[PDB]
Design a protein around this nucleic acid. Sequence first.
RNA 1: GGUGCAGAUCCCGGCGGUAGUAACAGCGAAGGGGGGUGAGAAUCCCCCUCGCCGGAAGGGCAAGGGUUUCCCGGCAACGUUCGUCAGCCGGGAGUUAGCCGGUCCUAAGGUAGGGCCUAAUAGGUACCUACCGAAAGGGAAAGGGGUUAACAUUCCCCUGCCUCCCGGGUAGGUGCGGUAACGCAAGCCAGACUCCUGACGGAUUGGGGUAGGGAGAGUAGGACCACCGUCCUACCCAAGCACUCAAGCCCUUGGAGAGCCGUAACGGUGAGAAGAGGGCGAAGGUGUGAUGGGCCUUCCGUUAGGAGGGUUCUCCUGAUCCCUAGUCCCCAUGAAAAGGGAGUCUGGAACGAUCCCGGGAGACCGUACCUAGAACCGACACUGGUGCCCCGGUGAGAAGCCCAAGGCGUCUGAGGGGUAACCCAGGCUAGGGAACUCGGCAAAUUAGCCCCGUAACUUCGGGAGAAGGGGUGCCUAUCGUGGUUUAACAAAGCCACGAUAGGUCGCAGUGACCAGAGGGACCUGACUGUUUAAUAAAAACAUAGGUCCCCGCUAGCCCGAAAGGGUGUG
RNA 2: AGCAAACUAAGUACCGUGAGGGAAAGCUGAAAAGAACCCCGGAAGGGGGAGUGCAAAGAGCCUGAAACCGGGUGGUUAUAC
RNA 3: AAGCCUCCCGGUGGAUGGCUCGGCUCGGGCACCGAAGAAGGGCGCGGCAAGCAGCGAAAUGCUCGGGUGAGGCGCAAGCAGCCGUUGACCCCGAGGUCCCCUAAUGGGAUAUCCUGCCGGGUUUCCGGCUCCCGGUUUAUAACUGGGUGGGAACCC
Lengths: 144, 77, 81, 101, 49, 54
Amino acid sequence: PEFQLQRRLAADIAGVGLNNIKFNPERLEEVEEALTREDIKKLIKERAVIVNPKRGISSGRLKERKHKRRSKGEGRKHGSRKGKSGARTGDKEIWINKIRKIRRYIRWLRDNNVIDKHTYRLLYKRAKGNYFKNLSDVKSYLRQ
Amino acid sequence: SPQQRSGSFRKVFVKLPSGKSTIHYERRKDNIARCGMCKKPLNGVKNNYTYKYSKTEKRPERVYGGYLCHKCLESLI
Amino acid sequence: IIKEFLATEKAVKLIESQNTLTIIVNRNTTKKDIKNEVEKLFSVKVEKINTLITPKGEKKAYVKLKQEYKASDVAHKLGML
Amino acid sequence: MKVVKYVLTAKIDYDGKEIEIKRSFRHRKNIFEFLKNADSNLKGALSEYAKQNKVKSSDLPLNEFITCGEIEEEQGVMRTECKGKEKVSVKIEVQTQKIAK
Amino acid sequence: KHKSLGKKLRLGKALKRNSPIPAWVIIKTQAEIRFNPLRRNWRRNNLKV
Amino acid sequence: MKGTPSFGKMNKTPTHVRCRRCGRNSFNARKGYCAACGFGRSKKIRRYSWQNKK
RNA sequence: GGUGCAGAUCCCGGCGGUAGUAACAGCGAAGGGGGGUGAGAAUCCCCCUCGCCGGAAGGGCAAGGGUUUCCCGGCAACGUUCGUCAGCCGGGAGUUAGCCGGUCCUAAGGUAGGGCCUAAUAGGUACCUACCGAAAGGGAAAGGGGUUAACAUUCCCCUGCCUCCCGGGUAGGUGCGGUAACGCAAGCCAGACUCCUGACGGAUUGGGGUAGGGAGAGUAGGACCACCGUCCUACCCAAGCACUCAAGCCCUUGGAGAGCCGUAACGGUGAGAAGAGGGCGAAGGUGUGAUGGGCCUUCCGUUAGGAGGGUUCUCCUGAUCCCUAGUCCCCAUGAAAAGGGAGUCUGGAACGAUCCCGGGAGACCGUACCUAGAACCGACACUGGUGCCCCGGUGAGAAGCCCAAGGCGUCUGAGGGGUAACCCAGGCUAGGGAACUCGGCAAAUUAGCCCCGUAACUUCGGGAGAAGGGGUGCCUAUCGUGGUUUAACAAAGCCACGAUAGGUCGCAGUGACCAGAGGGACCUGACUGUUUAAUAAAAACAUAGGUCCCCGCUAGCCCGAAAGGGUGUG
RNA sequence: AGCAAACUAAGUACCGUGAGGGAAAGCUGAAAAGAACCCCGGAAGGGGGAGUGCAAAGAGCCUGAAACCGGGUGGUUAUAC
RNA sequence: AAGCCUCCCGGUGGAUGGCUCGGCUCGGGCACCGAAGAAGGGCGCGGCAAGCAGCGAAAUGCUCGGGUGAGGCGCAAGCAGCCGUUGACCCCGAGGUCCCCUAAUGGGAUAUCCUGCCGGGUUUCCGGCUCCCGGUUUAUAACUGGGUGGGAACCC
């Protein structure tokens, strides 16, 4: 009664796992007569050999929990954090994003004649000296 | 027969409408031609793993064009 | 020089589907001429030759004829088919 | 097989003469990538034009060809106008066409 | 599997064969039961290199 | 450890391979020498007078 | 005369008793219902369901094995039980290359023949010549879709590429553009010399990609429907060819300071900055390859087949894989060749390609399968060793826990039991709290992250997570900072992190999982490292620092029988 | 026993990385006349009835000892070496 | 009932007895092989062929003489076929073919496998290719003709 040959030939024709191939209990005398790869291809078409699809993990719970985390701040707070502060936001990446935004903002102002070279050079050094904490801090200094 | 650095791994799917994924092994990039004491390969000179049989496509059109720029040269003429 | 003609179930399928013949030849390992040994004995033309050495002391050739000639006629003449 | 294909036509308008260039795409997000610069890509399209028909030195040495304007799509037909410096103008028109068997 | 043609190219007593008595010899010799005194198994015995 | 764990490292290429002259698996590969007939630095067959009891 | 056995932990053969007894548990898995075949089913086959792995129990390939591979038929032995099953037994079969590897090159190293030595060689070898030495180093050129029971960058189809040789043209011999960097169809054959790829450490960082993974819209199919309407699956494309490129380095102009330019950081500049123009230029991308496939799906006949539909759009995240630049470090300075390309000269002929088109050729050998709680070594289907490379939620994470894709219930003996004593692993205990004991051994306590706070001593670096104190869930809304999108800033869509206000429940909010008990005093070795493979990991060995001795090279110290040799390319 | 080797392959199988080490095992009958056929059994030089032969210890085959085990004969046994 | 002693029958077992195409010791004969490629090894060859023995791509045997006279196709009894009275099989004498490694010898082999350069006809294929000696040819070029390994013991 062994027909591991038909299960083996069907799984690579269908491109699924060998555990995804199920036979039809009412038409087993027909599966037992298949010997070639042409025979097996016809049975898959005639529904004598069933091919199960692969599954996935439902995303309903994950989508709702992620939305709450984003907008209300729920689940982000300090009873949920296991790792260190620098493993959640590296300190170097904080500085890289800060100093690039400041530089390309005052570079625009100089290129458009809002400010002169001396104020650009003065603000360029202050930014490198950590004088400002935000881009909102430089533009409050700009309006004096 | 596992990993060897003398070959770079590539995997391809962006410019891609069919559906599968695999891995291709190619040899590392060449360099402008070699021995050494003067040590400056050049500008406009070509190095490819195969040769397109080119002749003036792989060299400038000055006097010593492929040999080197006017740096290590004039004590040779 | 040719020793036998192979007529197994793989060899029969290749005659009908790929127009090739399967022969066992001497393994004299200085080969230019299996092409012109068959082109002389059977008066056919050869397109490709692929050769092999089985695990039990044989050298097996897969000689593929040109479309103008049928490998079935050569096989039929030998009595294989 | 492939269904849908996007065909771009550029009417190159430099002094006196007039050159028309074709270009196909496959996914409608590449259209805006091609036009994101439109200076490198159009100049490199003129090279293939010259290699096929004949003759060189038409309108190549023009300075920076100012990308494009804004794409507007009325009947699913994208249209834009791009110019550069002077004496060079281009009109672009992109056509969507279903392939079908 | 990389064989340097002294074992795979020459075939015989050097990477070939381990076989029972042919069936017609058993009938001819009328032997009560006829064995090959040199039978071995890939897993238990050892083959010289 | 001396016994069972160290016998696991005895599945590399062997120290002795086949010899053409005598047909025995005694050719020391790393030294270019057959340890049974001397093929490799003896033209004469390796033979000693203690090689059997008297 | 090989001549008499009860003993020699006598030698060999056969057989008892123990005894139908131990063992077939322990290393974190598990079966149940229905049906079949067969003389005979806990154990083989089919369907449903349930459980376990999921940085390995899944995927890919070595050395080694050697036919274990695939089909058919079996069950005397073989498998820790059974067996109708099998890596077992009988009968047939199976490995296809110009592009993959060997083959070639040299490395550390070796050998043969000459010389020198030896009583002699199957012995030694500093020298000369030749050869050998890597299936993970170097090394010309291929991809996709398909095909078998068993092979496939090897066979078929489509699209190619390399080296050499023919035939027909053409660029050259006798040609052009640019201030320049450079742009290009540029002669041929025979040499010489030269140059540059080949061709090279560690650490750390930016930028650009790609595999992968997500959200939304739509079209088909599936799953659930006590009430909601949500959830799963498919939506995608190779090499070659054309075009494009950031970093960096170059070329013209220009002419700056008591200053300007610029980075993540170091920095750059009259030996020429910024600003304007340009030249050479990755990984990839976009077209073509491809009205070709392969993916999902509907209907009819249900034999052979036939006839249709869809395969689209907008964004986000993202490598430990890829290429590209910085910087730093050494009493470390981090292979060699064959084989490639180019340049400059000399000689020769006037016919002639490194460019297009057509034709021919490219030996020889390996290729099946396992690659390991059953294919290798360990006497065994051995819990050991031999392996390397790869892989949604919570979370810092390749951890622990749960689950996809894939695999398994063969780490191959089962059933019954209100389940005795006892043993191996585990949970909890009132009052007391080391009274136990050589000894607090074992077990318990603590534990993540944020904020505050932190002594003596000290080689001034440390001690130090010293010690100690407070906070943490859920729900409803917000704010701030930053990324990305053809995107200075501001708007819009996605995304990350840090905070704020209010409401609320429990014995308990790092609620499981993961996860330091702390302090005072003395000896000893300074420290990181090493050791008795199989009873000793230490205060023993080493170490950096200190100090002493020999020696000017035909030396000092050491090896050899000699020729000679190591330190010494000093 | 006789050479280690009287035999389906002795320096053969098998053991060791290697130099090397190193077995076991003879016999139906004069002639295969080697047990047709029938009942049982899945099958089995398996059981029973037959048949061949001077004779079936008939393929596990000359003779067929003892230890050991099973069945039976004759004595005897649960108040005592 | 557990049993106990003795004999009989059976099983298991393989002693005893008988046998023997094998050994062991003496006497007597006889006594070298190899570059014209030895001894030793490896792979092949049978219609179905695994081993031993025999043989080598002419491969379970080819040719010519002599002997013998009816079967033959080894150990080894099957299925099937063939050879032989035109004298086979078998024995003796003389020839032919005689794969690879091997002193191994054109070069290389940790590949029993690869790969050259001259000459000849010409598919195949066949000859030549360290240390010395006597010669040729121009002189270090090239060419003609002439030890190496094995053997049970004995020997120097």
